[PDB]
Nucleic acid binder design. Structure first.
Length: 71
DNA sequence: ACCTGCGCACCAT
DNA sequence: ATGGTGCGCAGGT
């Protein structure tokens, strides 16, 4: 889908907005419920966003989080 | 189960 | 100091 990048970035923003860690599990869970795709597909799309440096994967306070690079 | 809301301690700069 | 972050809950669907 052409909207997948926006789906993931909006999900990261929404998890930050409710003060929840944007980890892989919550990102995949929210994309599935909002839009349909299975976690395997969201994992693959997220990896593309990391290679494009649109999303940053960081370790923070002992766990991995994903950051919207535009923010 | 599912979801959102949030105070404030924590962390890099 | 700044100014973003998310634990550990409360509370609703």
């Amino acid at each position: 889908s052409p909207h997948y990048q926006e789906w993931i970035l909006d999900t990261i923003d929404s998890l930050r907005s409710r003060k929840a860690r944007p980890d892989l599990e919550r990102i995949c869970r929210m994309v599935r419920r909002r839009h349909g795709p299975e976690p395997e597909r969201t994992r693959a799309e997220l990896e593309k966003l990391i290679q494009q440096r649109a999303v940053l994967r960081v370790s923070y306070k002992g766990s991995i989080s994903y950051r919207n690079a535009a923010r």
